[PDB]
Amino acid sequence: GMENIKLGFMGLGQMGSALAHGIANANIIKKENLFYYGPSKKNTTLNYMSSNEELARHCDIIVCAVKPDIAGSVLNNIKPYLSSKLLISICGGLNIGKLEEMVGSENKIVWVMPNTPCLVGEGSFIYCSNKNVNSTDKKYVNDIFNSCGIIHEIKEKDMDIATAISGCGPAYVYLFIESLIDAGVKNGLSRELSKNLVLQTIKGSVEMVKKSDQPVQQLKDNIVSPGGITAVGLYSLEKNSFKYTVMNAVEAACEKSKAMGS
Amino acid sequence: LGFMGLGQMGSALAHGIANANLFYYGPSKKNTTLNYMSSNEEARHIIVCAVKPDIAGSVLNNIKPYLSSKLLISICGGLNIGKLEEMVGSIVWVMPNTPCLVGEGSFIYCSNKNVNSTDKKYVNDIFNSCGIIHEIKEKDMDIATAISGCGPAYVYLFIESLIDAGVKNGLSRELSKNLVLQTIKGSVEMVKKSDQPVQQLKDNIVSPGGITAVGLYSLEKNSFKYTVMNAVEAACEKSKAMGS
Amino acid sequence: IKLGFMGLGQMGSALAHGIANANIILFYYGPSKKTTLNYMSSNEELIIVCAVKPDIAGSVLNNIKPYLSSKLLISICGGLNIGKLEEMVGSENKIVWVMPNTPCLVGEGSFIYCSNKNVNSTDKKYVNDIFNSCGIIHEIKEKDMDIATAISGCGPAYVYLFIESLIDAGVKNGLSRELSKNLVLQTIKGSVEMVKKSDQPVQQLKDNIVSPGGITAVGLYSLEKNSFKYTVMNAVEAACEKSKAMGS
Amino acid sequence: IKLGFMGLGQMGSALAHGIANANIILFYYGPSKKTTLNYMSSNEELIIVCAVKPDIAGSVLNNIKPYLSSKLLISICGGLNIGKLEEMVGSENKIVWVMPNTPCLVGEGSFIYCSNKNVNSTDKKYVNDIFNSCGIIHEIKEKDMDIATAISGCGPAYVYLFIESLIDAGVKNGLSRELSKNLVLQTIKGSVEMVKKSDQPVQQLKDNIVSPGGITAVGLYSLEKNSFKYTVMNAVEAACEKSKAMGS
Amino acid sequence: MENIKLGFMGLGQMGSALAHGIANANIIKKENLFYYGPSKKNTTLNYMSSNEELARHCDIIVCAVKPDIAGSVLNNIKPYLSSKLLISICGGLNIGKLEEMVGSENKIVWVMPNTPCLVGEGSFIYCSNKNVNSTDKKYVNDIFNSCGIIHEIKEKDMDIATAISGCGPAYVYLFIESLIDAGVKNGLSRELSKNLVLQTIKGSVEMVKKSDQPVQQLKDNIVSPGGITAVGLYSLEKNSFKYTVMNAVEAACEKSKAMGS
Numbered sequence A: 001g002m003e004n005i006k007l008g009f010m011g012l013g014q015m016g017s018a019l020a021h022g023i024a025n026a027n028i029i030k031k032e033n034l035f036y037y038g039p040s041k042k043n044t045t046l047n048y049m050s051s052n053e054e055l056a057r058h059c060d061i062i063v064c065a066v067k068p069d070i071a072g073s074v075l076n077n078i079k080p081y082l083s084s085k086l087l088i089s090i091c092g093g094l095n096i097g098k099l100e101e102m103v104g105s106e107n108k109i110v111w112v113m114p115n116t117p118c119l120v121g122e123g124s125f126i127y128c129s130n131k132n133v134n135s136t137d138k139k140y141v142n143d144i145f146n147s148c149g150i151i152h153e154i155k156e157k158d159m160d161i162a163t164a165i166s167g168c169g170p171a172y173v174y175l176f177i178e179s180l181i182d183a184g185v186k187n188g189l190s191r192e193l194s195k196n197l198v199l200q201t202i203k204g205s206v207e208m209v210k211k212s213d214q215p216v217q218q219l220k221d222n223i224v225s226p227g228g229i230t231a232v233g234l235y236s237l238e239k240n241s242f243k244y245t246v247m248n249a250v251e252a253a254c255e256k257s258k259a260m261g262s
Numbered sequence B: 001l002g003f004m005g006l007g008q009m010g011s012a013l014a015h016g017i018a019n020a021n022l023f024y025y026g027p028s029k030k031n032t033t034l035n036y037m038s039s040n041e042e043a044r045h046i047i048v049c050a051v052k053p054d055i056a057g058s059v060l061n062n063i064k065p066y067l068s069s070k071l072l073i074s075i076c077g078g079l080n081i082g083k084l085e086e087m088v089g090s091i092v093w094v095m096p097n098t099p100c101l102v103g104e105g106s107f108i109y110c111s112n113k114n115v116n117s118t119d120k121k122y123v124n125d126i127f128n129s130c131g132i133i134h135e136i137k138e139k140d141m142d143i144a145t146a147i148s149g150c151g152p153a154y155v156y157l158f159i160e161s162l163i164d165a166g167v168k169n170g171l172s173r174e175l176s177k178n179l180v181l182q183t184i185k186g187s188v189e190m191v192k193k194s195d196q197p198v199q200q201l202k203d204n205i206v207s208p209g210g211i212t213a214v215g216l217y218s219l220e221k222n223s224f225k226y227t228v229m230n231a232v233e234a235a236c237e238k239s240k241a242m243g244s
Numbered sequence C, D: 001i002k003l004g005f006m007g008l009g010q011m012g013s014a015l016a017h018g019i020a021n022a023n024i025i026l027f028y029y030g031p032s033k034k035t036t037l038n039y040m041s042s043n044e045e046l047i048i049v050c051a052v053k054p055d056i057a058g059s060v061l062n063n064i065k066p067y068l069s070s071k072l073l074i075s076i077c078g079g080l081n082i083g084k085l086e087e088m089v090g091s092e093n094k095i096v097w098v099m100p101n102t103p104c105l106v107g108e109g110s111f112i113y114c115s116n117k118n119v120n121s122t123d124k125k126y127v128n129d130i131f132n133s134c135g136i137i138h139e140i141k142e143k144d145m146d147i148a149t150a151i152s153g154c155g156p157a158y159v160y161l162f163i164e165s166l167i168d169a170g171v172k173n174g175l176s177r178e179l180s181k182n183l184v185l186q187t188i189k190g191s192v193e194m195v196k197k198s199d200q201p202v203q204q205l206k207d208n209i210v211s212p213g214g215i216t217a218v219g220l221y222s223l224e225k226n227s228f229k230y231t232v233m234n235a236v237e238a239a240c241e242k243s244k245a246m247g248s
Numbered sequence E: 001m002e003n004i005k006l007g008f009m010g011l012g013q014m015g016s017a018l019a020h021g022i023a024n025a026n027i028i029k030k031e032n033l034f035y036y037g038p039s040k041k042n043t044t045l046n047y048m049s050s051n052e053e054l055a056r057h058c059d060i061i062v063c064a065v066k067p068d069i070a071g072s073v074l075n076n077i078k079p080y081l082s083s084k085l086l087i088s089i090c091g092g093l094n095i096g097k098l099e100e101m102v103g104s105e106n107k108i109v110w111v112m113p114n115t116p117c118l119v120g121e122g123s124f125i126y127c128s129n130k131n132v133n134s135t136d137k138k139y140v141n142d143i144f145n146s147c148g149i150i151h152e153i154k155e156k157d158m159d160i161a162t163a164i165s166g167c168g169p170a171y172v173y174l175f176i177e178s179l180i181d182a183g184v185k186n187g188l189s190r191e192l193s194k195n196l197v198l199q200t201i202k203g204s205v206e207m208v209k210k211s212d213q214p215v216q217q218l219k220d221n222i223v224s225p226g227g228i229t230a231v232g233l234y235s236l237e238k239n240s241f242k243y244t245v246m247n248a249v250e251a252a253c254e255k256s257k258a259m260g261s
């Protein structure tokens, strides 16, 4: 049972709308029980509400989907209306300590880190919660995000690196896909065909990792025919520090999450 | 259906078709469900040339008299139709990848003058059972090989690098793997479903003054895009070099 | 209203001459006479524009401090935020921080502004009307002024250098400088017009020009090799860092 | 006159729709139906525009070879020069090599052309009128076509990426994508307008924006660090090399 | 030593390698080897209900957990370590940090192992506090010399020794991995490349071990004037091979000191 509880989204930006419509299409909560507020009305199936305060006073679970720089004032305005209610924050960088500083230690605070793929029911989520979040609250959190993806409960200290991989990850994958298509378009292939060949190559590779008992590096080794084509392409990636480039990008994002966390 | 050579690609392609619902030869017997045959010459058969390109010349020379009205399919890298017609006489050239083992392979092919629409129908059915196949121009085979054939290795290293970054900064290797694979799965799904181009989907994740922006800026610094494009082009160049 | 431009240098003149050619509303002072605007004996001599360099703006604004009662002070000084400006003239004064660019000289400027508590709707109405006459003005947050400066204020310099580099490339490979310039400016004019009119994003418009196996794909590959995007981004961020450092 | 666009892809459509919106003079063929232009059964079916990719242009022009008698053939294929074109249809035909860009869709294209011996003043008058209606056209030497392509033809892609990188920099540092875009496009619009109107050279216009000890000087220093000029020049030259290689 | 009870707190990658390394050496009875983890492991060692129970039961306690949770784990076993030998394999966490976690009253020894101890070829360095005597060091030496070679070194030298001996295998694995990839790229099979690589390294180590000539002279010996080796060695200098190896070690040593701060 989750059809009766009222879900409220404070802000419907790029992540807010993706998460809102991700849960809406999953059908675990009734359409008339999904609410939102923004300074401007959005093209959405969710029910508009007059303010964040009236959203917090009506809804049972409140989602903070605003930018972290304006999250402090928004949460301060709904501060007295969070009594006995569950607050879920998707704000990047803002950890439980900073959130407890914004609304109070007495409230139920859970910090969830989503990604945009939840729109197509394939989101990746990580979360941590404060002292006041119980087993029945965690059951609500799990069911909401498992309906439009896969959720893990992790330590609070691991949230910054997880954000860098799971939250920011799509962007690295999008750019990877973008770069592979461009390489194809440059060397004779159409943009449509390049995209098909790229997406199917990645889909197959991911499935191989999941299903095979062999590690990723052995699966990589298997493709390298002695004196062949793949060996030359991989040699090029090593030359240009492909591994370090990816690792450095993730770590740079991880530092930014921690910098905002101070 | 006969596989000449049962190595990493041979076994992957063989078991991919077998699971979809078969003979092979190698200098050593392999741990496989396929039926072993005494030689490449043993005339019995669709013939798949799954040997390395450096030995394919002599191996195809041995089966030259036994290819009378038989459909020869070659998966050898670099060796184009002109190079193959020199080896067996004036044939379809198919470029697979290992993910066909789990029925999710990517294939591209071109055919000579002797291959008609009925052989093409069998070509499409054999490979669409364990993946997706496209008929392309022969000139496009080298770049397609670079992306589709070599591609999984680029992705594996991409996955490998993302896990390493998670491990380095506190996450367990197992959790890092789960998060990486789901993130990639979700992103690919977004591309093929969305009406927005991939770059706009990339823009949507960049919250102004946020974390992702710093990650992408780091990728631009170290020329991530050029790195990927240079790797594909290096492989494409090698494919054309062996085809010369 | 009577405008007074304190400093008539490179930005002071460009702004003053931009509003003058717009015909909507002019006085100035400098240590040396410069212009169609009417010269005045000093800065103290009685809307006021502070168009001096930030290193001398401290003493210059401190001299006109007791003379800015019920008068609208607009500052175009880079880096010096409202916090720094209220330290220079006082919290009680009506202060608005506007960031212009030189293209306002030809009536095509880009402006961003923020204002303190004392600036009201009627004051903002004047500010908006003054700068929309010779360009486009946006009211933004004070925190966003540093990045907005780095793009809108410093921007022309990146674009001039962009034009400069494209012309040089044409000249190097056989084209005359005049023809190279003509082709470059039109190519950019058409591209800018394509972005604001097309429903497709800028990257899709970029994808449309890339013919498979073609010429554009090779040039665009060269830009990726030399980290073109990072280079542009690093420059804007470096400028943004400088603006915040001066505001500290 | 009756225009016929052989190929209606990314450039074919942009050019055809550019002249269509200009209202001065329309037919097309493709392997798949696309547009307001009238579809025709084949390329052979009877001014002709060859708007296909250069790799297939050889056979495509060879099919219409006996049908181009006393007809003006304009080719927009990149790399394929008049020497390569006269090999494809014959020396006796009237051939003109025009290099367009996609901005002609919004009536702001940039064109360069050269023509063989058989193209006369009346043929050039038509060519000039067709392309001046949706942009600006210049007649240049054939030898200069490769560099002119690299700048005017491929140019929009460099400008789109320039716009793309500036927007990303704004987004990274707190600005919304919509505002970043607005500021970027206006900043560039004003800069382009400053170059064509000012009597000062582009580098002097760049010097005017650099305040001593200021913000611009730091961003411009960052561009010099990352070889911004070379990057732009290397890209144009790389494209120019590609155009000549395809023309060989 | 068959009678003393050894306990491992955490059987991860290093925990299990050290545990099974000692187990295969047969110096301590099978029934006398104990472990605890939040999840039961596929191991020959006897499972125990908690770390506190493990501390109460065993004569020697091994801290094989990650350094970020070692503080709370050692805090829980704090009242159960009286007269017992505590050995810590945690990276970065020096004696100062350990005495801060359990108290300077305890017998604390900091040992830095590597996974090669699983095949009885581990490299160990150790330092101990004021309370660890000669008889305790007798136990330490015999435990780790059974599955490798142990050295007693200065506490200040532990960070660089960790960077070489502890982290070392990873560099060697990558080195081996890279040499195979080079063979595979240029026509050799993965199996043959591996065999040639491992034998080449095995022989080279033995030459450094047994020769009166320094490593650099042994290097010079293989370089024939105008030959093949010269070209390969020049390529390594071009891409700063020596610095790369040295920088990696220093970056690791830097990280060990940062955690020890």
Ligand SMILES: NC(=O)c1ccc[n+]([C@@H]2O[C@H](COP(=O)([O-])OP(=O)(O)OC[C@H]3O[C@@H](n4cnc5c(N)ncnc54)[C@H](OP(=O)(O)O)[C@@H]3O)[C@@H](O)[C@H]2O)c1
Pocket (backbone or CB within 6 Å): A222, A223, A224, A225, A226, A228, B004, B005, B006, B007, B008, B009, B010, B025, B026, B027, B028, B029, B040, B050, B051, B052, B053, B055, B059, B075, B076, B077, B078, B095, B096, B097, B098, B149, B150
């Ligand atoms: N991912 C990929 O690996 C991939 C992708 C696309 C295309 N390909 C193509 O597939 C071909 C094989 O690649 P691979 O990676 O599988 O190489 P591989 O692992 O070396 O496989 C070659 C196999 O052929 C066998 N063989 C050797 N000599 C033979 C002979 N005289 N007659 C018959 N069989 C013989 C070998 O058996 P033994 O093991 O007993 O020596 C070996 O198992 C290459 O041409 C490559 O271009 C591979």
Ligand SMILES: NC(=O)c1ccc[n+]([C@@H]2O[C@H](COP(=O)([O-])OP(=O)(O)OC[C@H]3O[C@@H](n4cnc5c(N)ncnc54)[C@H](OP(=O)(O)O)[C@@H]3O)[C@@H](O)[C@H]2O)c1
Pocket (backbone or CB within 6 Å): A010, A011, A012, A013, A014, A015, A016, A037, A038, A039, A040, A041, A052, A065, A066, A067, A068, A070, A074, A090, A091, A092, A093, A113, A114, A115, A116, A167, A168, B204, B205, B206, B207, B208, B210
């Ligand atoms: N992929 C991702 O983008 C992603 C992934 C993981 C986490 N996140 C997190 O999600 C949050 C939002 O990111 P985003 O990318 O969606 O940014 P965004 O697109 O700028 O979304 C912010 C939205 O909040 C609205 N808003 C502004 N002020 C408000 C207020 N006072 N009360 C309620 N709503 C207000 C805005 O509406 P208007 O448009 O009308 O101004 C805007 O649509 C960030 O904290 C980020 O860390 C994002």
Ligand SMILES: NC(=O)c1ccc[n+]([C@@H]2O[C@H](COP(=O)([O-])OP(=O)(O)OC[C@H]3O[C@@H](n4cnc5c(N)ncnc54)[C@H](OP(=O)(O)O)[C@@H]3O)[C@@H](O)[C@H]2O)c1
Pocket (backbone or CB within 6 Å): C006, C007, C008, C009, C010, C011, C012, C029, C030, C031, C032, C043, C051, C052, C053, C054, C056, C060, C076, C077, C078, C079, C099, C100, C101, C102, C153, C154, D208, D209, D210, D211, D212, D214
């Ligand atoms: N494109 C741009 O240049 C640009 C863009 C945005 C913002 N800004 C801002 O505009 C301000 C000025 O920039 P700029 O490039 O115009 O610098 P500038 O060319 O050096 O102009 C400063 C002018 O102020 C005059 N001046 C010097 N001391 C004075 C005083 N004590 N009282 C009154 N006037 C005095 C100087 O006159 P003399 O010539 O007689 O010495 C000089 O012409 C800076 O704060 C900058 O942040 C400039």
Ligand SMILES: NC(=O)c1ccc[n+]([C@@H]2O[C@H](COP(=O)([O-])OP(=O)(O)OC[C@H]3O[C@@H](n4cnc5c(N)ncnc54)[C@H](OP(=O)(O)O)[C@@H]3O)[C@@H](O)[C@H]2O)c1
Pocket (backbone or CB within 6 Å): C208, C209, C210, C211, C212, C214, D006, D007, D008, D009, D010, D011, D012, D029, D030, D031, D032, D043, D051, D052, D053, D054, D056, D060, D076, D077, D078, D079, D099, D100, D101, D102, D153, D154
């Ligand atoms: N910005 C630019 O893209 C640009 C700028 C300057 C010059 N050019 C030049 O313009 C030419 C085309 O460029 P593009 O970017 O438009 O490439 P494109 O988007 O691939 O357009 C080519 C079009 O030709 C059609 N086509 C294919 N085979 C044909 C045939 N046998 N007969 C007639 N039409 C056929 C295709 O139709 P289907 O879609 O049905 O396959 C396709 O739409 C190139 O030669 C290039 O050098 C382009």
Ligand SMILES: NC(=O)c1ccc[n+]([C@@H]2O[C@H](COP(=O)([O-])OP(=O)(O)OC[C@H]3O[C@@H](n4cnc5c(N)ncnc54)[C@H](OP(=O)(O)O)[C@@H]3O)[C@@H](O)[C@H]2O)c1
Pocket (backbone or CB within 6 Å): E009, E010, E011, E012, E013, E014, E015, E036, E037, E038, E039, E051, E064, E065, E066, E067, E069, E073, E089, E090, E091, E092, E112, E113, E114, E115, E166, E167
């Ligand atoms: N080669 C090496 O890895 C190496 C070399 C030298 C030194 N070290 C040192 O050895 C230590 C562990 O390294 P590692 O690579 O083995 O990390 P690891 O593979 O993550 O092992 C840590 C293990 O501790 C367990 N654990 C977690 N919480 C526990 C608790 N409260 N009580 C008892 N056990 C708990 C975990 O069990 P679950 O799996 O059930 O969570 C995990 O298996 C580190 O301090 C490191 O500095 C490692």
Ligand SMILES: [Mg+2]
Pocket (backbone or CB within 6 Å): A202, A203, A204, A206, B184, B185, B186, B188
């Ligand atoms: Mg996938």
Ligand SMILES: [Mg+2]
Pocket (backbone or CB within 6 Å): B022
């Ligand atoms: Mg059967």
Ligand SMILES: [Mg+2]
Pocket (backbone or CB within 6 Å): C025, C026
């Ligand atoms: Mg007047």
Ligand SMILES: [Mg+2]
Pocket (backbone or CB within 6 Å): D025, D026
């Ligand atoms: Mg008409």
Ligand SMILES: [Mg+2]
Pocket (backbone or CB within 6 Å): E201, E202, E203, E205, E206
């Ligand atoms: Mg050895």
